[PDB]
Amino acid sequence: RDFNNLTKGLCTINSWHIYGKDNAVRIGEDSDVLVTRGPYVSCDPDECRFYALSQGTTIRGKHSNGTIHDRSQYRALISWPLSSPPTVYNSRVECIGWSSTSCHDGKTRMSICISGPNNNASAVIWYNRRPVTEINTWARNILRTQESECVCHNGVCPVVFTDGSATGPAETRIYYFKEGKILKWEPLAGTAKHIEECSCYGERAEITCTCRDNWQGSNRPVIRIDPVAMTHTSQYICSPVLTDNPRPNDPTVGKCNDPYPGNNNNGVKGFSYLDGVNTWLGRTISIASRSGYEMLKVPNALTDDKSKPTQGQTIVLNTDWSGYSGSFMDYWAEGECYRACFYVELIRGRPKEDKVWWTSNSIVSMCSSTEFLGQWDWPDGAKIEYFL
Amino acid sequence: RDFNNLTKGLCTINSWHIYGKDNAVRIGEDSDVLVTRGPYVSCDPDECRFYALSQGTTIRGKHSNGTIHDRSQYRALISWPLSSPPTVYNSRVECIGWSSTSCHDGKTRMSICISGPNNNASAVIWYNRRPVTEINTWARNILRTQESECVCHNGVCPVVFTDGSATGPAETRIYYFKEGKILKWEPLAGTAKHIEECSCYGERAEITCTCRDNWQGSNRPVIRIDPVAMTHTSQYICSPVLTDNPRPNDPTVGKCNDPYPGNNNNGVKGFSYLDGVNTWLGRTISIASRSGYEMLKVPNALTDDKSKPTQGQTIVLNTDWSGYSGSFMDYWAEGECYRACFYVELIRGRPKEDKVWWTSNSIVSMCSSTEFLGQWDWPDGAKIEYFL
Amino acid sequence: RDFNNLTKGLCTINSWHIYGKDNAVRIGEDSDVLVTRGPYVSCDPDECRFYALSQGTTIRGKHSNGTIHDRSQYRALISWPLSSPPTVYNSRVECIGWSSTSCHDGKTRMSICISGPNNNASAVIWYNRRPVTEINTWARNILRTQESECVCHNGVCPVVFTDGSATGPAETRIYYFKEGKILKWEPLAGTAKHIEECSCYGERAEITCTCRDNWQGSNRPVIRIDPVAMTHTSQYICSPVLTDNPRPNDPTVGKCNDPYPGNNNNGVKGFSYLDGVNTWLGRTISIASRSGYEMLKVPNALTDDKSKPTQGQTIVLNTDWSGYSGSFMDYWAEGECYRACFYVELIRGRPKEDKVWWTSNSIVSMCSSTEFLGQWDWPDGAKIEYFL
Amino acid sequence: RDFNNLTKGLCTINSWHIYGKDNAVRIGEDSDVLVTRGPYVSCDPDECRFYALSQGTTIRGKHSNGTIHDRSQYRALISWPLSSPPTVYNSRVECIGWSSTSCHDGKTRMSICISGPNNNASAVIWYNRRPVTEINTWARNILRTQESECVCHNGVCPVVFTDGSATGPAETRIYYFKEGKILKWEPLAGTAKHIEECSCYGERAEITCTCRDNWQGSNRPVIRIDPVAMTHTSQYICSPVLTDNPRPNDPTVGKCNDPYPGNNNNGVKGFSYLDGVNTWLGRTISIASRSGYEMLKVPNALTDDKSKPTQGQTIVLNTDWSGYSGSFMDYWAEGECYRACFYVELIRGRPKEDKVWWTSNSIVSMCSSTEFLGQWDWPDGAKIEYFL
Numbered sequence A, B, C, D: 001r002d003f004n005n006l007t008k009g010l011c012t013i014n015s016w017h018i019y020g021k022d023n024a025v026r027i028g029e030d031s032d033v034l035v036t037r038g039p040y041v042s043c044d045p046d047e048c049r050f051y052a053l054s055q056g057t058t059i060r061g062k063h064s065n066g067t068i069h070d071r072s073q074y075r076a077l078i079s080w081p082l083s084s085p086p087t088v089y090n091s092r093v094e095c096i097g098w099s100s101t102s103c104h105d106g107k108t109r110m111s112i113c114i115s116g117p118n119n120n121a122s123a124v125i126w127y128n129r130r131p132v133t134e135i136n137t138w139a140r141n142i143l144r145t146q147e148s149e150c151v152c153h154n155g156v157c158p159v160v161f162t163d164g165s166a167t168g169p170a171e172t173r174i175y176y177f178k179e180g181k182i183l184k185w186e187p188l189a190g191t192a193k194h195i196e197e198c199s200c201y202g203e204r205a206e207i208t209c210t211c212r213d214n215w216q217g218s219n220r221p222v223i224r225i226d227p228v229a230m231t232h233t234s235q236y237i238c239s240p241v242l243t244d245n246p247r248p249n250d251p252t253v254g255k256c257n258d259p260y261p262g263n264n265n266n267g268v269k270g271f272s273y274l275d276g277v278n279t280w281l282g283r284t285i286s287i288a289s290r291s292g293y294e295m296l297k298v299p300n301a302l303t304d305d306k307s308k309p310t311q312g313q314t315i316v317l318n319t320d321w322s323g324y325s326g327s328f329m330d331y332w333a334e335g336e337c338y339r340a341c342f343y344v345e346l347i348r349g350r351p352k353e354d355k356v357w358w359t360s361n362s363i364v365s366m367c368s369s370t371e372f373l374g375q376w377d378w379p380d381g382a383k384i385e386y387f388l
């Protein structure tokens, strides 16, 4: 195998088709399904799999009580076959920790898991399923990373990390790994003022990451990385179609180089595909909670501060719970272009559904089509009442 | 691997021997077995597997309530090892949707799943376990397909779809795929007046499909496809041995080019092997409900409108529930001929057994023998009373 | 791969060491373990596995009620990893039926399963996991076979079948298969008067089978097969150490060419290794029930009608339940000789333990050592009281 | 594949990073997890796995009652994927017995399991998953071995066994195996007065084992083996930092060639890495019970009888239960040095938590880092109250 190179551009996105859905919470009501959160999808050259942060207990287990908590010693990055649920018996542990990223470089996979107390966390970088490099916290305040796949080009796999306050200036770093080793790292540059949980994809030797400004911005920060030069830039999506959550109502003009104000100290992981007129943004339908999910075609959203939608697709109705969302692509597919894909985490339980004592999720994921396909909505589908 | 070619003829069918049986409902009374319906069997060059449409819940799970419903967002085409039950832990998701077909072309497998609301469904064609082509609804009324395996010849795998009313004229199309891409498609031609759920097999470079006329006919429509010319014909099985269900009592003369009347707007997926004197038809024993199942040798059934049985084999007694049935063959077996095989879906639960709130099934499947073997009957075997 | 040839002799048996044990009934009290009976062990060139006739239900399942019954449509030959229990999720179905045999010829495996009603059963011979040949009942009275592995030599795998009364003269046949096809078959010859459930092994191009005379004999019938000439002989173990069950007390002189009398119309599958002074016989300790199990070294047992034990090893105490037993060897091991192995079925439930409504078993298996090792006893280990 | 040779030295240990954790007891509260004890970790050239002695029952099963007992016929050495829990469905049985060791030589794996009554136990040595050699008890008093991985060099895999009293002089032997066969064996020599459960690792063609003096010493005995010469030496860790348990408080001068007194007839399996200034010792935090676990850097601990700690890392708090601990390394990793690793058994249930009737454990394991990483504590995490 040779390292994969990002030689293709994105396929034209005219609509989104169903790719995978695990129905985990439904199935887990009567089977040994692990409690998770922070899911994602990532492909190897011969298979694509679902990934997530386990909570080290089944949903029906008594240890499901208290799983709203984010960082415990019982969490691990697990992967499992596409569209099956994350069960005790089919889940493969990639590494131990409560924050992660993972990507295949064409030869083998790199997985990164961070663990530890808030003031003393460390990342362990695994490559070819063995630990290779370790990075200690630099700001002693919840060292943390993407929560979705990283992207590689000719062996170089950039990864975005943040350490420091989630509600003020923090220390974000872009690490350039190759075979699990650090080639270089750089501090964040550009006009993004705060970075969290970047969702990335690659095309034509450029990696684009759409992140979460948890401090002040309801528009999303964007980091664009050149994996050959090992350099990057940052800005915000200019469009007035705001895609974080919670967020204020959409204005008619956005902000390119500063956080769009109105909501502080909160957000949700999200993503976008920024490709000139072939630009599609995801977002929750609700401006107040993680409810609903839609894709909007917003030509030149990255650079046009008045850009509005020209087409759309509802993924999850506003009467259904959503959650994190992120990008991934099958870089080893046939054809002349890379097909954009995304997943949506469907969060169930606390804090929105507090009759149960747990927090978990299921996954739904779609990929683009060049056809203009009919739309459906894809809820988690479980009935909370059954778990009482 | 090279694409498989249909170079052999059918083996002589003198009787049927047991091939596989999963006992899913029995086992599922106390194990994590998924609720399914619309099962089938399909072989790869190195393995044969069971397939079905999951309902995204176990049978003992509380989400089993309401599984009589046909089309939900929680369904998926799953496959699992021959004769094991479809469990949460061994079921491999092929694609997401509530109508499907799947077949191996000798190099890799094509799987097709349709999803969406009734007026806006779409098919996604997967090839080598990746999405390749998408087809939007053309008649905005439950785009749908075979519910059993497709057949390939030199890479070309024809698939029959229907979109439109299930109880009147509809728009049936024959698509010719190769490597998941559309080479051609044609509207139904010939004298079949309505087509549903075709069951197909191939021999000597011809593909024969036996379908369900849900509108007016109790005789079954037959589509014969030339996968090299990418052309087809259609008619009805001429024989007076009527094989749909429900159906009127058998007459002494059938109809070759029109629906045999007596029962409207209902039917059941079924199949036949039409090979001159080596012709065998399957059918439910009951004319009123999906009860019992038998194979009848009816020489020249396709073309002889007075043809009657010369031999038979009971598969499922009339005091046991049956359901859908369809054809498949192991195209990669040794020997000089293709051995005809079929499965029968054994439906349990609603609507016939309404003391439980679910609907599921188990599978029984047989293949032909050149011997004249003794017969047994093969019920699902589960006791409904145990699930109360 | 080339077909395996029986070029080695047996290793010297000085004692028996533990080889595998699945503890199925213990584990199955709280996990999805299938109800079985008629277990055995068989090796492939790269793995050795446990085999058995499933009853198509878990032990805790409500369908476990009535599993004392021998022949139902819900049975199948299943195999699973050595020493794991036969679970719903790890059991691989080899074929459907209620009587079986299976063996690897060095290239691939042949498995045979018989199914059907008592007066119309048929065997299906599978080879390379595909059905190849079928054999209809010849005496219309429970066509049936070994219940333990068959043995191959240069592709030829002889199999012993019986059809007819279990309590009087019956029609026993020796079939010689190669690649799942019938090369030849012969009626039983020699002085054995009734044959059931033969346990076989091979060494130096000769296959020796120790069987169960269910009609009149408490000594065991022996069939010796030449797989090159495709011919055989039969007699009884001459020794006065009687090894069927139930049986009369041991005399001082046995019978070589006729059934040793005292007990009619009953027996148990068993085995022996007959190799001059290196001869070891297995038997239940009790003369009245399937309780206890011991190995006795009885030099020249086959040909010496006064032969008595010179050494022994207790396998299962007389206060613990035993059951069927049979031979197998790893023909693909390293070294200069074939190591004799055997399994003992540990039957639990009915009819001896009738507080539960099921019948199942676990497995214990040993192989010979050239050392004189200390002995232990190996009970099933489950507490019946827990299942109440 | 060629046999692995110990050509590298240990990497510099500046801290320990999380490697694996299965959370077995937490998950097992509501899933089919086997009861175990005596766990360890061992790598093959392409995978690293968790190992342990099963008790042949699930934790929630009724057969969990009485699992404080050490030696039953229902135990087996099982292995399972790194960081998953030992479940009924994913656990692979390596051999049957209640004491074990296992190691890969670069070509295939050797596993050794001992079974039998106290006065008549025997070891069976498996190689390439087949039984090859057997060793009968030599002192008729619980023949027993390491309970953690063995180490190989150019095919030679030394293994330490003990037979005789656990509370007085016993007969310890060092066996040198190659391809499962005995090349040589030697009686213990040197100044160690009693040896139990050695934890070993290899570097630069030398194998170092840290053991448990169950008779008189609270300092640990050390055996150093030359696998080429097939010779060894023994002594005690000279340091006053005492690492057995229970144990007296630390003195200021230890003992190099005799047991450090104060506590008799008890101990716990443990380990160390003895590499000049790069020396790290593990131990329970409590001097009285198996509670807590810490790593201490004690330069020249092996040879300096006044050596004290210069650095440390807490692994398990003193308010959490610990248990056995042992060494392993991935000998097939990339790079120029071998990364030291260890596991800690987290024992739950009896005798410390007697509200439940079982005894089981979970696993936590770490490997060294050349960075100075922040520390966290890693408890088992299960709530006993949930199992009541």
Ligand SMILES: *[C@@H]1O[C@H](CO)[C@@H](O[C@@H]2O[C@H](CO)[C@@H](O[C@@H]3O[C@H](CO[C@H]4O[C@H](CO)[C@@H](O)[C@H](O)[C@@H]4O)[C@@H](O)[C@H](O[C@H]4O[C@H](CO)[C@@H](O)[C@H](O)[C@@H]4O[C@H]4O[C@H](CO)[C@@H](O)[C@H](O)[C@@H]4O[C@H]4O[C@H](CO)[C@@H](O)[C@H](O)[C@@H]4O)[C@@H]3O)[C@H](O)[C@H]2NC(C)=O)[C@H](O)[C@H]1NC(C)=O
Pocket: A240, A241, A248, A249, A250, A285, A286, A287, A294, A295, A296, A308, A309, A310, A311, A312, A313, A372, A373, A374, A375, B119, B120
């Ligand atoms: C069969 O399936 C097909 C294919 O899916 C179906 O066809 C699809 O139908 C969709 C629904 O109508 C349609 O999606 C919409 O597309 C609009 C763009 O098209 C229109 O404008 C362009 C440009 O002028 C024209 O060329 C075009 O012809 C159309 O006229 C989007 O604008 C739509 O999104 C907006 O509306 C929805 C509500 O429906 C919001 O949820 C969404 O966020 C957008 O509106 C908010 O945002 C904008 C931008 O700032 C604001 O201006 C606006 O006021 C809204 O703001 C409020 O709401 C947001 C969200 O809560 C909040 O943040 C904010 O603060 C405010 O409170 C929508 O995307 C598909 O394009 C169409 N596809 C095709 C191929 O045709 C077909 O219907 C199906 N058939 C049947 C029979 O069912």
Ligand SMILES: *[C@@H]1O[C@H](CO)[C@@H](O[C@@H]2O[C@H](CO)[C@@H](O[C@@H]3O[C@H](CO[C@H]4O[C@H](CO)[C@@H](O)[C@H](O)[C@@H]4O)[C@@H](O)[C@H](O[C@H]4O[C@H](CO)[C@@H](O)[C@H](O)[C@@H]4O[C@H]4O[C@H](CO)[C@@H](O)[C@H](O)[C@@H]4O[C@H]4O[C@H](CO)[C@@H](O)[C@H](O)[C@@H]4O)[C@@H]3O)[C@H](O)[C@H]2NC(C)=O)[C@H](O)[C@H]1NC(C)=O
Pocket: B240, B241, B248, B249, B250, B285, B286, B287, B294, B295, B296, B308, B309, B310, B311, B312, B313, B372, B373, B374, B375, C119, C120
């Ligand atoms: C051991 O096993 C062996 C092997 O299996 C057993 O032998 C098998 O025995 C079977 C049962 O007898 C037998 O199957 C029958 O074969 C008949 C054909 O053979 C006869 O006719 C030919 C032609 O003349 C002769 O050459 C031959 O020698 C025989 O005489 C079929 O005709 C049979 O099917 C009909 O009967 C059954 C009821 O038994 C129906 O279920 C079936 O649908 C057929 O009848 C309906 O349909 C016809 C056609 O239209 C009508 O004319 C008729 O009135 C019936 O219609 C009503 O019912 C249907 C169904 O509900 C409904 O739709 C309709 O409207 C009406 O209400 C049957 O297939 C096997 O061939 C034979 N095999 C061999 C190799 O011998 C042996 O018995 C076993 N031994 C023991 C001891 O058990």
Ligand SMILES: *[C@@H]1O[C@H](CO)[C@@H](O[C@@H]2O[C@H](CO)[C@@H](O[C@@H]3O[C@H](CO[C@H]4O[C@H](CO)[C@@H](O)[C@H](O)[C@@H]4O)[C@@H](O)[C@H](O[C@H]4O[C@H](CO)[C@@H](O)[C@H](O)[C@@H]4O[C@H]4O[C@H](CO)[C@@H](O)[C@H](O)[C@@H]4O[C@H]4O[C@H](CO)[C@@H](O)[C@H](O)[C@@H]4O)[C@@H]3O)[C@H](O)[C@H]2NC(C)=O)[C@H](O)[C@H]1NC(C)=O
Pocket: C240, C241, C248, C249, C250, C285, C286, C287, C294, C295, C296, C308, C309, C310, C311, C312, C313, C372, C373, C374, C375, D119, D120
């Ligand atoms: C550590 O482990 C080692 C290794 O396992 C242990 O050593 C083993 O000890 C075993 C038990 O003593 C021993 O097994 C016995 O071997 C006898 C043969 O040896 C003796 O005879 C020879 C020949 O003369 C001498 O060379 C030799 O030195 C000995 O003296 C067998 O004869 C024994 O079997 C008979 O006894 C047992 C009861 O213990 C029966 O269950 C068994 O069926 C045999 O007896 C029945 O059958 C014979 C034959 O027909 C009859 O003559 C007799 O009356 C019995 O018949 C009744 O019972 C049967 C069964 O229910 C019934 O069908 C019938 O109708 C009648 O009712 C036994 O096999 C091992 O060989 C020995 N191994 C070694 C290597 O030393 C050591 O003890 C262990 N240490 C500790 C401390 O525990």
Ligand SMILES: *[C@@H]1O[C@H](CO)[C@@H](O[C@@H]2O[C@H](CO)[C@@H](O[C@@H]3O[C@H](CO[C@H]4O[C@H](CO)[C@@H](O)[C@H](O)[C@@H]4O)[C@@H](O)[C@H](O[C@H]4O[C@H](CO)[C@@H](O)[C@H](O)[C@@H]4O[C@H]4O[C@H](CO)[C@@H](O)[C@H](O)[C@@H]4O[C@H]4O[C@H](CO)[C@@H](O)[C@H](O)[C@@H]4O)[C@@H]3O)[C@H](O)[C@H]2NC(C)=O)[C@H](O)[C@H]1NC(C)=O
Pocket: A119, A120, D240, D241, D248, D249, D250, D285, D286, D287, D294, D295, D296, D308, D309, D310, D311, D312, D313, D372, D373, D374, D375
């Ligand atoms: C972020 O994470 C980083 C990295 O982990 C954290 O930094 C780590 O902090 C650790 C805790 O302070 C520290 O570990 C200690 O290291 C000591 C060695 O360093 C000191 O001495 C050297 C040599 O002079 C100096 O160079 C150095 O600068 C330091 O001054 C060890 O000595 C420590 O172990 C002893 O203490 C602990 C209690 O904390 C005991 O559990 C342990 O067993 C040791 O003490 C017992 O044993 C000794 C030896 O015999 C006795 O002398 C002593 O009296 C104790 O004996 C009693 O207790 C034992 C155990 O129960 C019993 O058997 C006996 O009988 C007696 O009853 C300890 O290992 C790390 O090295 C340090 N790492 C780095 C890289 O800095 C940082 O804090 C974290 N940050 C935050 C904000 O949390």
Ligand SMILES: *[C@@H]1O[C@H](CO)[C@@H](O[C@@H]2O[C@H](CO)[C@@H](O)[C@H](O)[C@H]2NC(C)=O)[C@H](O)[C@H]1NC(C)=O
Pocket: A002, A003, A004, A005, A106, A154
């Ligand atoms: C990705 O690009 C690099 C070139 O920059 C390719 O690397 C060369 O691969 C060939 C085949 O192994 C070698 O002969 C060269 O030495 C490689 N290295 C470089 C840096 O030139 C790589 O093959 C490309 N990947 C694919 C899948 O084509």
Ligand SMILES: *[C@@H]1O[C@H](CO)[C@@H](O[C@@H]2O[C@H](CO)[C@@H](O)[C@H](O)[C@H]2NC(C)=O)[C@H](O)[C@H]1NC(C)=O
Pocket: C002, C003, C004, C005, C106, C154
């Ligand atoms: C078992 O014996 C037969 C010989 O009787 C061996 O068969 C020969 O195998 C070689 C290698 O494939 C061929 O060249 C010959 O044509 C084979 N056939 C015969 C009948 O001669 C077979 O190889 C032996 N098996 C092993 C494992 O050695």
Ligand SMILES: CCC(CC)[C@H](NC(C)=O)[C@@H]1[C@H](O)[C@@H](C(=O)O)C[C@H]1NC(=N)N
Pocket: A038, A053, A069, A070, A071, A098, A099, A100, A142, A143, A144, A145, A147, A166, A196, A214, A267, A268
């Ligand atoms: C405190 C910083 C947060 C991100 C801005 C926080 N990340 C971590 C590593 O704890 C996330 C946030 O609290 C949760 C959410 O917003 O859903 C998930 C939670 N993420 C994870 N548990 N992995």
Ligand SMILES: CCC(CC)[C@H](NC(C)=O)[C@@H]1[C@H](O)[C@@H](C(=O)O)C[C@H]1NC(=N)N
Pocket: B038, B053, B069, B070, B071, B098, B099, B100, B142, B143, B144, B145, B147, B166, B196, B214, B267, B268
């Ligand atoms: C409305 C058209 C019907 C076929 C003629 C219908 N097909 C679909 C895709 O819904 C089937 C029919 O209603 C059910 C049955 O007859 O058993 C199954 C049902 N099929 C599926 N749920 N896959």
Ligand SMILES: CCC(CC)[C@H](NC(C)=O)[C@@H]1[C@H](O)[C@@H](C(=O)O)C[C@H]1NC(=N)N
Pocket: C038, C053, C069, C070, C071, C098, C099, C100, C142, C143, C144, C145, C147, C166, C196, C214, C267, C268
């Ligand atoms: C009626 C003939 C019997 C053998 C002599 C009978 N065999 C079959 C195929 O039914 C066996 C016997 O009744 C049972 C036993 O003895 O344990 C098992 C039972 N064997 C199986 N169920 N496979």
Ligand SMILES: CCC(CC)[C@H](NC(C)=O)[C@@H]1[C@H](O)[C@@H](C(=O)O)C[C@H]1NC(=N)N
Pocket: D038, D053, D069, D070, D071, D098, D099, D100, D142, D143, D144, D145, D147, D166, D196, D214, D267, D268
């Ligand atoms: C009697 C000798 C003991 C070791 C010094 C004893 N070993 C065996 C083989 O029984 C261990 C000891 O009793 C237990 C413990 O200390 O935790 C485990 C127990 N070990 C195992 N059950 N494998």
Ligand SMILES: [Ca+2]
Pocket: A212, A213, A214, A215, A216, A217, A218, A244, A245, A263, A265, A266, A267, A268
């Ligand atoms: Ca924000």
Ligand SMILES: [Ca+2]
Pocket: none
């Ligand atoms: Ca359960």
Ligand SMILES: [Ca+2]
Pocket: B212, B213, B214, B215, B216, B217, B218, B244, B245, B263, B265, B266, B267, B268
């Ligand atoms: Ca009809």
Ligand SMILES: [Ca+2]
Pocket: C212, C213, C214, C215, C216, C217, C218, C244, C245, C263, C265, C266, C267, C268
């Ligand atoms: Ca008898």
Ligand SMILES: [Ca+2]
Pocket: D212, D213, D214, D215, D216, D217, D218, D244, D245, D263, D265, D266, D267, D268
């Ligand atoms: Ca001690």
